[PDB]
Write an enzyme that holds these catalytic residues in place. Structure first.
Site, PDB file in Angstrom:
ATOM      1  N   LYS E   9     -29.466 -27.300  32.966  1.00 22.00           N
ATOM      2  CA  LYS E   9     -28.419 -26.575  32.276  1.00 22.00           C
ATOM      3  C   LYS E   9     -28.890 -25.624  31.486  1.00 22.00           C
ATOM      4  CE  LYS E   9     -24.693 -29.818  32.228  1.00 22.00           C
ATOM      5  NZ  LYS E   9     -25.009 -31.080  32.995  1.00 22.00           N
ATOM      6  N   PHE E  57     -11.949 -31.909  28.744  1.00 19.11           N
ATOM      7  CA  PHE E  57     -13.284 -31.359  28.207  1.00 19.11           C
ATOM      8  C   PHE E  57     -13.694 -29.854  29.165  1.00 19.11           C
ATOM      9  CE2 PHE E  57     -13.792 -34.830  31.328  1.00 19.11           C
ATOM     10  CZ  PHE E  57     -14.346 -34.093  32.450  1.00 19.11           C
ATOM     11  N   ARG E  85     -30.260 -40.713  39.226  1.00 21.06           N
ATOM     12  CA  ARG E  85     -29.484 -41.428  38.468  1.00 21.06           C
ATOM     13  C   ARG E  85     -29.991 -41.944  37.216  1.00 21.06           C
ATOM     14  NH1 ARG E  85     -25.009 -38.791  36.879  1.00 21.06           N
ATOM     15  NH2 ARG E  85     -23.179 -39.285  38.136  1.00 21.06           N
ATOM     16  N   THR E  91     -25.267 -40.809  30.499  1.00 21.78           N
ATOM     17  CA  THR E  91     -24.751 -39.641  30.358  1.00 21.78           C
ATOM     18  C   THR E  91     -24.621 -38.899  28.886  1.00 21.78           C
ATOM     19  OG1 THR E  91     -23.470 -39.541  32.406  1.00 21.78           O
ATOM     20  CG2 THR E  91     -22.651 -37.944  30.485  1.00 21.78           C
ATOM     21  N   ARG E 105     -32.422 -37.224  29.364  1.00 21.90           N
ATOM     22  CA  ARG E 105     -31.313 -36.618  28.535  1.00 21.90           C
ATOM     23  C   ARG E 105     -31.526 -37.048  27.131  1.00 21.90           C
ATOM     24  NH1 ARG E 105     -27.076 -38.365  32.826  1.00 21.90           N
ATOM     25  NH2 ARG E 105     -26.528 -36.421  33.777  1.00 21.90           N
ATOM     26  N   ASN E 115     -26.157 -32.333  27.998  1.00 20.69           N
ATOM     27  CA  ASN E 115     -27.028 -33.211  28.433  1.00 20.69           C
ATOM     28  C   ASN E 115     -28.277 -32.942  29.160  1.00 20.69           C
ATOM     29  OD1 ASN E 115     -25.995 -32.902  30.779  1.00 20.69           O
ATOM     30  ND2 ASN E 115     -25.030 -34.783  31.253  1.00 20.69           N
ATOM     31  N   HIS E 118     -27.883 -32.038  35.248  1.00 19.34           N
ATOM     32  CA  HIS E 118     -26.616 -32.604  36.110  1.00 19.34           C
ATOM     33  C   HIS E 118     -27.033 -32.951  37.354  1.00 19.34           C
ATOM     34  CE1 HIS E 118     -23.388 -31.718  39.023  1.00 19.34           C
ATOM     35  NE2 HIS E 118     -22.459 -32.184  37.833  1.00 19.34           N
TER      36      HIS E 118
END
Lengths: 150, 213, 46, 61, 201, 249, 48
Positions: E9, E57, E85, E91, E105, E115, E118
């Site tokens: 991100k 959101f 994951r 998350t 994270r 975070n 993704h």
């Protein structure tokens, strides 16, 4: 082990448009389909497959972005060479108001660099030129009324 | 017989590179009820690099469907959004630049930012006339026929003259515009020019280098 | 109101042969891929 | 009749193209097929050209 | 060996932490088969996040992902989805710091929605997103080659325009040479298709 | 084995031949070469040479190519040329059309300093000085551009790429060991196939450095060190041509 | 099945003394052990 090899061989090389896993599959498929009774040339077949692969270049939805390192530090380093010409005022083509340089009292820094390189100590000879130009930049500034730079 | 036309607005970067746009269409099926029924259809339009302005994309079969007549095709007409730097003309690009007088006469470099992520610095080759243009080959929009060739960028030069000049500045300009050729100068002329240049490029009391304020 | 055409029936009856050929070519691709995987394993051992 | 004309005219190439379209799963398979056929004929001709060029270079050496 | 989608991100990019994340990814056994730095537009981001589509959101989520360039990666590993994951961790960033420290994270992510990574949830979403961002990356040869699914895809594709092209070829009957017929049918297909429009100057 | 010639090794090995640059310009080059390399999207950018003017403000000229492909039996490099009076800021050298490319070869004498100079030739034709400079650079590059043989190879899609396994040239003294840049790797064309006495090679066997000087263009030098495979070239001096070669030799 | 292709690829011989199967295996082994810079083009330029 073998999983690492398989994951490596499928790395998609951008400029070639394909990995080796696809290229190997295509070469094996072309050899299998046209059953060769005579000798085959691996390099010749590889070049032919490379020339024959389909590549449907289609319009990507996004405009490409440049992957280029930041250039602020190097631009600032360059900005000490040469004289910066006085900018022009768009409203009236006459130049913007300016100040004359300052009258600092520094030593012979180029000679100092020469001496230091002669003795074999201090910084290099090119960094001496950079330091001299940066010290001129500091001393000349009419905002910083400097009587001495060293 | 009737077709619905719609402007499709693009930026010069998209047309230069070739976008793949998605567009929404409101199709009205008409029935016995007073209110018509509307639905949103998604259409993918592929604009290839360098497509000329006024290009029409026609989708056949889509459009408001009356009970009896099968709907006529919908038309999308390409138009470019205004760009802060370039305006496209035919196949190439026009960049209008306001240029000071001394940049024209003495000569400097124009710094322009292309649609592609490159920064051109084009020198002023000679004394730029009022209304003159500078052409940089192979810098305009791509040719729609062949995806490798390019047009030639055109820089239309607009001169920005100074608003004020003092009498001594005009004297200097006059002396610069009537200097005898170097094979016709006296020795006094040569010594005077040497003195004036050494006093204009003086490192402390000369005004060749001034820091802005 | 009644609307049989020959070409519709011809194309529709011709469709299965095309699908069969496509399936055969897909099988060719699958066996080629599995041969390449065996080649990769042998190369690692080598 | 017409079926034979279609078959011995375009059937093998169309089957190859449909197999490629199944494998690739593009976003517009019909345009994929058309470009595939164009590239099919083009790559055949340039394949012949490639063999010709290799032979010429060997002879020159 | 399975392939998962991932993206870095703008918060881990504006801080110049992309290369550290990539090196950490490579250190844990992953393989980056494809990477691309790009910049989503509003429409593209809204299309990418179709599963939410109006949740609470969604406004801030779509306003954040279009605030700067992101990175898109395709990772390859035997347990790629579950392993990635785990590697990202929980998350919620504060819950991540509390429960599992030294996770991407916890370290780089901050402030809830940012975070810093993704990932894909299931192989369905993984394949969907990979095809969304890498249209030409080959993969999944088993879920498309089923004879039933192959026949179904051919059925979905051929009735729109190929049958009409074959009918036109049979009716017109051009030169018996197969190359001319191939060229004519290709022109007909690229000229008559329901997906793309007809282009005129 | 190298992929691009250094700007420091070239100035070091060609210092004796007078192919030197000012120290301030050398630091400015070190800073502002990558800036222009990134501003122009070029994978390769090196200093090509330095041309003398009637002022002290010589033209530093750097060339850079993005793609290099085989075309009609010629290794065509899509070169871009940039010029600078000082090492800091670079400008571009736009190519020249054939009419002025033939009306620029008749203008002789060493150039002036300001690149906004108009030569007048014979009705009168006005030609910019930048055009003349571009013509001279093109002529020198056509006549001189030299690299060791087998240092480039042809891959798929017909692109010339550096030969990563280049083991070096035996007999560096022989002119056969060197070739023009625009010669295809397969073709056995070298500098031997040029005129007999237009290239002088002096090779120091001990230090393993060979030096090739152009006599038709006196200001072009090219060094090749063989102990570590490093070759570079520079043109220093005015761009004029030496017509009367027969008398001098 | 794959057995047919495997049995076929070991009888066919190439310009080199080894079979095409063994040639491809050796090429892949060299590529995996060396890890070249631009590997796909290095296949046509360096390994074979």
């Amino acid at each position: 082990s073998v999983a690492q090899a398989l994951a490596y061989l499928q790395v998609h090389s951008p400029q070639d448009g394909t990995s080796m896993y696809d290229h190997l599959v295509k070469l094996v498929s072309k050899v299998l389909e046209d059953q060769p009774k005579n000798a085959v040339d691996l390099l010749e077949t590889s070049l032919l497959v490379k020339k024959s692969t389909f590549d449907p270049k289609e319009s990507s939805p996004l405009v490409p972005i440049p992957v280029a390192p930041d250039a602020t530090q190097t631009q600032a380093a360059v900005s000490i060479f040469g004289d910066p010409e006085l900018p022009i005022n768009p409203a009236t083509g006459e130049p913007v108001p300016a100040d004359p340089p300052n009258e600092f009292e520094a030593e012979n820094m180029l000679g100092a660099a020469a001496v230091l390189d002669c003795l074999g100590v201090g910084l290099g000879r090119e960094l001496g030129v950079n330091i001299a130009l940066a010290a001129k930049r500091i001393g000349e500034d009419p905002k910083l009324a400097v009587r001495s730079v060293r | 017989g009737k077709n619905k036309v719609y402007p499709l607005e693009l930026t010069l970067e998209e047309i230069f590179h070739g976008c793949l746009k998605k567009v929404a269409h409101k199709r009205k099926v008409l029935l016995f009820s007073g209110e018509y029924v509307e639905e949103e259809r998604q259409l993918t339009v592929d604009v290839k690099p360098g497509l000329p302005t006024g290009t029409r994309f026609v989708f056949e079969g889509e459009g408001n469907k009356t009970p009896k007549k099968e709907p006529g095709p919908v038309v999308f007409v390409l138009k470019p959004k205004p760009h802060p730097r370039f305006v496209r003309r035919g196949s190439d690009l026009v960049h209008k630049v306001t240029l000071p007088l001394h940049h024209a006469l003495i000569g400097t470099t124009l710094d322009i930012r292309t649609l592609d992520d490159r920064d051109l610095k084009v020198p002023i080759s000679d004394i730029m006339r009022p209304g003159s243009s500078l052409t940089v080959p192979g810098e305009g929009m791509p040719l729609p026929a062949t995806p490798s060739a390019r047009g030639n960028l055109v820089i239309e030069i607009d001169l920005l003259f100074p608003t004020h000049l003092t009498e001594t500045q005009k004297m200097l300009l006059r002396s610069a515009f009537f200097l005898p050729p170097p094979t016709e100068q006296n020795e006094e002329t040569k010594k005077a020019l040497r003195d004036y240049e050494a006093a204009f490029k003086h490192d402390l009391k000369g005004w060749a280098t001034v820091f802005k304020r | 109101r009644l609307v049989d055409p020959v070409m519709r029936e011809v194309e529709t009856a011709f469709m299965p042969w095309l699908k069969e050929q496509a399936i055969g070519y897909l099988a060719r691709g699958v066996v080629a891929r599995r041969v390449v995987d065996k080649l990769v394993e042998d190369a690692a051992a080598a | 009749h017409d079926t034979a004309y279609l078959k011995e005219t375009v059937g093998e190439a169309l089957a190859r193209g449909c197999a490629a379209a199944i494998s690739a799963q593009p976003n517009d398979p019909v345009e994929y097929l058309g470009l595939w056929l164009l590239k099919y004929v083009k790559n055949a001709e340039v394949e012949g050209n490639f063999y010709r060029e290799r032979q010429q270079d060997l002879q020159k050496k | 060996l399975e392939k998962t989608f991932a993206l870095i991100k703008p918060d881990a990019v504006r801080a110049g932490k992309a290369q550290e994340i990539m090196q950490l990814i490579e250190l844990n056994g992953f393989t980056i088969i494809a990477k691309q730095k790009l910049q989503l537009t509003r429409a593209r981001a809204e299309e990418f996040y179709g599963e939410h589509k109006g949740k609470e959101f969604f406004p801030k989520l779509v306003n954040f992902m279009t605030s700067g360039p992101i990175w898109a990666l395709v990772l390859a590993k035997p347990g790629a989805i579950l392993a990635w994951r785990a590697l990202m961790g929980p998350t919620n960033v504060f819950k991540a710091r509390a429960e599992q420290p030294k996770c991407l994270r916890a370290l780089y992510g901050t402030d809830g929605t940012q975070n810093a990574t993704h990932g894909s949830d299931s192989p369905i979403s993984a394949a969907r997103e990979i095809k969304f961002f890498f249209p030409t990356l080959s993969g999944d040869p088993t879920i498309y080659a089923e004879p039933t699914a192959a026949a179904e895809y051919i059925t979905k594709r051929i009735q729109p325009a190929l049958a009409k092209a074959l009918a036109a070829l049979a009716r017109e009957k051009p030169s018996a040479d197969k190359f001319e017929a191939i060229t004519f049918v290709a022109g007909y297909l690229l000229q008559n298709n329901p997906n793309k429009p007809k282009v005129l100057m | 084995v190298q992929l691009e010639p250094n700007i420091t090794l070239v100035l070091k090995h060609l210092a004796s031949c007078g192919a030197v640059v000012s120290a301030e310009q050398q630091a400015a080059l070190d800073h502002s070469i990558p800036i222009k390399r990134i501003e122009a999207g070029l994978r390769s950018l090196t200093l090509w040479g330095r041309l003398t003017t009637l002022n002290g403000k010589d033209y530093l000229v750097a060339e850079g190519y993005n793609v290099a492909s085989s075309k009609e039996g010629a290794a065509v490099y899509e070169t871009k040329y940039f010029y600078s009076q000082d090492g800091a800021r670079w400008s571009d050298l736009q190519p020249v059309d054939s009419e002025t490319a033939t009306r620029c070869a008749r203008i002789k004498g060493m150039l002036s300093g300001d690149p906004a100079k108009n030569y007048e030739l014979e009705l009168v034709f006005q030609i910019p000085e930048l055009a003349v400079l571009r013509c001279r650079v093109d002529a020198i590059a056509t006549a001189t551009s030299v690299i060791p043989t087998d240092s480039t190879i042809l891959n798929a899609a017909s692109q010339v790429v550096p030969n990563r396994l280049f083991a070096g040239a035996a007999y560096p003294e022989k002119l056969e060991s060197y070739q023009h840049r625009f010669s295809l790797p397969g073709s056995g064309v070298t500098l031997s196939q040029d005129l007999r006495g237009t290239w002088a090679v002096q090779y120091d066997a001990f230090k393993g450095v060979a030096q090739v000087r152009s006599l038709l263009f006196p200001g072009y030098f090219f060094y090749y060190a063989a102990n570590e495979l490093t070759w570079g070239s520079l043109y220093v001096g005015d761009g004029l041509r030496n017509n009367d070669l027969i008398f001098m030799l | 099945d794959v057995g047919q292709a495997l049995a076929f690829l070991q009888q066919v011989k190439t310009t080199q003394g080894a079979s095409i199967y063994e040639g491809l295996k050796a090429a892949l082994a060299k590529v995996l052990e060396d890890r070249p810079v631009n590997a796909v083009e290095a296949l046509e330029t360096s390994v074979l």
